[PDB]
Amino acid sequence: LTLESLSNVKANSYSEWITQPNVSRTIARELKSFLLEYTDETGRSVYGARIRTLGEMNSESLEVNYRHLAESKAILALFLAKCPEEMLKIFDLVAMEATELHYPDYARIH
Amino acid sequence: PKELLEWQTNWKKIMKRDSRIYFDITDDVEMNTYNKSKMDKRRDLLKRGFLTLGAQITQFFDTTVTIVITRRSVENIYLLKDTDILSRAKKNYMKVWSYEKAARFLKNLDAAPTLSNLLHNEKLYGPTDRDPRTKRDDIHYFKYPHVYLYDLWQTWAPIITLEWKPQELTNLDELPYPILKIGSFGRCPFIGDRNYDESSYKRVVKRYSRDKANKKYALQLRALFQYHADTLLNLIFIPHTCNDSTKSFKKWMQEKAGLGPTRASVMSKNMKSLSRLMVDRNSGYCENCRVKYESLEQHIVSEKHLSFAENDLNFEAIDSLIENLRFQ
Amino acid sequence: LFNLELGRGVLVDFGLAEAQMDNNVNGVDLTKGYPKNETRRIKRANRAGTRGFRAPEVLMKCGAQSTKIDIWSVGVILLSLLGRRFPMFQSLDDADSLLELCTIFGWKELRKCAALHGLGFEASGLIWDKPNGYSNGLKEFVYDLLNKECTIGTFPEYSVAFETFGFLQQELHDAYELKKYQEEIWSDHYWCFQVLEQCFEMDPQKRSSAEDLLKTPFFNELN
Amino acid sequence: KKVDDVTGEKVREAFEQFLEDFSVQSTDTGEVEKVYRAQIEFMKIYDLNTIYIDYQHLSMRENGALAMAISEQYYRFLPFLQKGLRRVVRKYAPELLNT
Amino acid sequence: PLRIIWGTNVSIQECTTNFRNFLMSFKYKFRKILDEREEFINNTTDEELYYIKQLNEMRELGTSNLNLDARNLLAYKQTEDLYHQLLNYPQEVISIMDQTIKDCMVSLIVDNNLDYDLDEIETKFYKVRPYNVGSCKGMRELNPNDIDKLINLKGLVLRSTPVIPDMKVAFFKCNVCDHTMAVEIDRGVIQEPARCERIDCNEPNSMSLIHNRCSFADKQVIKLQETPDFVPDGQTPHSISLCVYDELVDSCRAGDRIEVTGTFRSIPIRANSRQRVLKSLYKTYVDVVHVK
Numbered sequence A: 001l002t003l004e005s006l007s008n009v010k011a012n013s014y015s016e017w018i019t020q021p022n023v024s025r026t027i028a029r030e031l032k033s034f035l036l037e038y039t040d041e042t043g044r045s046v047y048g049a050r051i052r053t054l055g056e057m058n059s060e061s062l063e064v065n066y067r068h069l070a071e072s073k074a075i076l077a078l079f080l081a082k083c084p085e086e087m088l089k090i091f092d093l094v095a096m097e098a099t100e101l102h103y104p105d106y107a108r109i110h
Numbered sequence B: 001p002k003e004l005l006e007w008q009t010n011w012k013k014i015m016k017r018d019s020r021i022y023f024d025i026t027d028d029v030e031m032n033t034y035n036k037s038k039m040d041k042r043r044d045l046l047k048r049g050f051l052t053l054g055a056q057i058t059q060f061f062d063t064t065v066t067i068v069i070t071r072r073s074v075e076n077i078y079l080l081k082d083t084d085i086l087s088r089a090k091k092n093y094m095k096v097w098s099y100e101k102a103a104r105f106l107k108n109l110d111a112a113p114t115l116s117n118l119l120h121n122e123k124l125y126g127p128t129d130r131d132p133r134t135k136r137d138d139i140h141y142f143k144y145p146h147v148y149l150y151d152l153w154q155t156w157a158p159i160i161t162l163e164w165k166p167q168e169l170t171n172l173d174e175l176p177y178p179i180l181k182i183g184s185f186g187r188c189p190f191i192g193d194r195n196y197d198e199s200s201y202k203r204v205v206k207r208y209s210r211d212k213a214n215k216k217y218a219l220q221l222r223a224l225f226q227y228h229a230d231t232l233l234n235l236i237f238i239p240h241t242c243n244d245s246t247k248s249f250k251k252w253m254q255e256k257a258g259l260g261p262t263r264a265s266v267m268s269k270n271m272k273s274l275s276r277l278m279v280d281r282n283s284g285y286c287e288n289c290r291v292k293y294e295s296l297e298q299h300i301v302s303e304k305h306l307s308f309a310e311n312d313l314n315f316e317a318i319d320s321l322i323e324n325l326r327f328q
Numbered sequence C: 001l002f003n004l005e006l007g008r009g010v011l012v013d014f015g016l017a018e019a020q021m022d023n024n025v026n027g028v029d030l031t032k033g034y035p036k037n038e039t040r041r042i043k044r045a046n047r048a049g050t051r052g053f054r055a056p057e058v059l060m061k062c063g064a065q066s067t068k069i070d071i072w073s074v075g076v077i078l079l080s081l082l083g084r085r086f087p088m089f090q091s092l093d094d095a096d097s098l099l100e101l102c103t104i105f106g107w108k109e110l111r112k113c114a115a116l117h118g119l120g121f122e123a124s125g126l127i128w129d130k131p132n133g134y135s136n137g138l139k140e141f142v143y144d145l146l147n148k149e150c151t152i153g154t155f156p157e158y159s160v161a162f163e164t165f166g167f168l169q170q171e172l173h174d175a176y177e178l179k180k181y182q183e184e185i186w187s188d189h190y191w192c193f194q195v196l197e198q199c200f201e202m203d204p205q206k207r208s209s210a211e212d213l214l215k216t217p218f219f220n221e222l223n
Numbered sequence D: 001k002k003v004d005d006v007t008g009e010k011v012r013e014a015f016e017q018f019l020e021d022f023s024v025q026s027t028d029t030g031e032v033e034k035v036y037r038a039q040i041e042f043m044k045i046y047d048l049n050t051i052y053i054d055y056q057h058l059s060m061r062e063n064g065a066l067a068m069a070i071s072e073q074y075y076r077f078l079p080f081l082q083k084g085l086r087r088v089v090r091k092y093a094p095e096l097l098n099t
Numbered sequence E: 001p002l003r004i005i006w007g008t009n010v011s012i013q014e015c016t017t018n019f020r021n022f023l024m025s026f027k028y029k030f031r032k033i034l035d036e037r038e039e040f041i042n043n044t045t046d047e048e049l050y051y052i053k054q055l056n057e058m059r060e061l062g063t064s065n066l067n068l069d070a071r072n073l074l075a076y077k078q079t080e081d082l083y084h085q086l087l088n089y090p091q092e093v094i095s096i097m098d099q100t101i102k103d104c105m106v107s108l109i110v111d112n113n114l115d116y117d118l119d120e121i122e123t124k125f126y127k128v129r130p131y132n133v134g135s136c137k138g139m140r141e142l143n144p145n146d147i148d149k150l151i152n153l154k155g156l157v158l159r160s161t162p163v164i165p166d167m168k169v170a171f172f173k174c175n176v177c178d179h180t181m182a183v184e185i186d187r188g189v190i191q192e193p194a195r196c197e198r199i200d201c202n203e204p205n206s207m208s209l210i211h212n213r214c215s216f217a218d219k220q221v222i223k224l225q226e227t228p229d230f231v232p233d234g235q236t237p238h239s240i241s242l243c244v245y246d247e248l249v250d251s252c253r254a255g256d257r258i259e260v261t262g263t264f265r266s267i268p269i270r271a272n273s274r275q276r277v278l279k280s281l282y283k284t285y286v287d288v289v290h291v292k
């Protein structure tokens, strides 16, 4: 689906809208795109550097700035602000798929 | 065509050593999941083909990226947000290709199994009904250090198929496979000198005693071939820095002072099942009678051998040869 | 049969001799393991040699068997003479002889030799000294072969077999009539190892015939 | 994902080609009529449920591989034949799909 | 030294060599001398190698069976032990005989350089049928120490059950991913898989048995009315049950007088259908090897 499709919710509530399988899948795809695409004014990918360094310290914490995601994809920011548990459950898998692109064995230890 | 060929070649060189390449994931059009599997397949095929050319692919977007391939249309790049990636690409002078342009680029820059073959494979290797990737049960798989003497076509038997458990190879002295431990005193290098050592004093004494006998024998050996290989003929010998048996002896004194029968290739399942049930409690093979014998002299006195001896119709060729060799 | 005081030879035992006149399927990855029950046959070779002299083509049971078992065997006799070890190849069985060829020439070298014959050989684990064999060749192998039995000190005192130790020592390290004997022995003694590497070639088609062995510069004075 | 049966799918392909390709010469005139498309058309107007296939017709295809595959492993290949017939009738006479 | 199968006195190597020598070097004049018939020895038939020509015509005709007379083993000197080993331990000695018959079939064209291909012969599974194993002592004069021995019996066939499929290979299919495995039977027991074999699919209890894909073999039960040579005082005739397998199915018709040589077997019988409880008193039957 599209971001404009996610702008208009078919369900009455946000809780069962994100819970829907196709909506969850396209939200996961958009979050993976957010981690892959985003870059700073300098030009380096801040999220790639964060993933590389958290793999370096073997730590499982990812620091995602909300302002970056708001200025990149605002509908996901509203979705995360209003229904945090369901968005964070998907975005955990998104972050693991992002860090799987560099370290295949990282899913084995953590 | 030649100028196009050289232009494509030197652009291949430049896109090899100075191009960072990034692929896009997001889509602008609502489209089905079963068609999304098609999108995943085309992305994976173009990935493996571009790996086949040998270009290294980085997963993350960056400012060092040169050419971007996207699924979204080339027409829409003008009418998008600043925060979108295509605006960043056109700002930083990056070339953007769609699958139409990229597939045209890849093609411009470069059998059915049939039913009878499938049924023939069905007869030999069983069903194709299961998952091919999973380990089939009635075929052994190696988990231990092995040697596997097989053939590619697999028409002939996997010839010598043998692995060892770590408990068997634990010993550093006896090993099932040969090791090059060399040795000394004319012995074979693989067995070595495990039984006894040549550094002992008594062994040195017996070797020196045999050496005394060998001097006279070795003198003619040196003298015959000193200058000529043939007998077309006092001796000169090269000094050596390395030690000797006599100097070591001197140092020790200073310290002191079946043909067999051919058998079938394949064995039976009941025969292999009987190997697990076995516990503990001059000779040769005659090919004329094609039997094993405990002793030769008992095989001489036997009805089949004596009946073979009295017959002369099986040495007829021999007989003809005898006759020829009589009047040569 | 060879007689020293006359210096000539003769051959017997032609009792085992004879004369000769002349892709991918999905699944069933047999390259990682053998079936538990065997139904396919084993190729009926002409395996009839003596232990330790059987050609590597004979070890792998080539259906079209050439003439060139004998030339590799005379190479083996040459290497035993130069190596000063008599029973140099001893085989408990066939695969023992395959590993015996592996520990001198290398796993990779015999895999390439196996490739032309149509069969692939894999060895997993198998700890030994030289992981890829000797890339230089047979020089360093016969070098430390003599070094062990020399430093032990059981070797006899005759300088008939000490010229090779000095010779091989200067290759691995790197009276006027004495210097003449030097340069002559140095030249043709380098030549015999040189002709030995072509005498030990794995591929029979690349392996030169005995007539080519006669016209080598090593055998000049007998002509 | 479910694992597919490559020989089963090719039996299905061969059967669905047989259902639309096979033909005989007319006895009275000599025209070339494809008898199984005619059978499907006959089922279309009477709403029949059963298609009758002569085995000698099936044996003429290839060198006999398809008929032998159907003969030895009929139980294994029967649903594949059913879905092949389903595809052929969908392509030709879709009104038999609904009922 | 020499290895012996546990519970027996049988060596595979020794029995193989002895039977190979017997097959290579038997003449029917030995059977003439053993039966005390010297005046009936003739040159043209007795002095010919019996089993050599029988295996040759076995090769020409495509026959996969050798009919072996056990008295011929007593005729040969080296196999007089093997004869007893055939009577006491048929189960493995017959397998030894089949394996060395296959070896002999290979050898007769390897040594003599025939034009027959080795692939067809080594694909074939040759099996032996011993017969004339001894005196025809009665069923009711046998003892539990005679279990799994070779026995020869007279009889009249009264009836036979229809062809019974006994299941040799089992075919299991996954319900969710349609992954299948085939498991061989092992002494009458088939191990059904608890988990799916696939790495991707490991669902528990997802394997179901498909009864028509799994391979079966023929088994028939024949009721035989025995006619012993010796009948004890007031012994009233009985019927035995004899089980024939594979090729021997439907070879005996109702009402024929036959010579059954087979293996004396005993199995426990379940007391109830729902329970796995077995009866301590065993049911005896004959596992038929050869029918004359």
Ligand SMILES: [Zn+2]
Pocket: B286, B287, B288, B289, B290, B299, B304, B305
């Ligand atoms: Zn003999």
Ligand SMILES: [Zn+2]
Pocket: E174, E175, E176, E177, E178, E179, E196, E197, E198, E201, E202, E203, E206
């Ligand atoms: Zn499964």
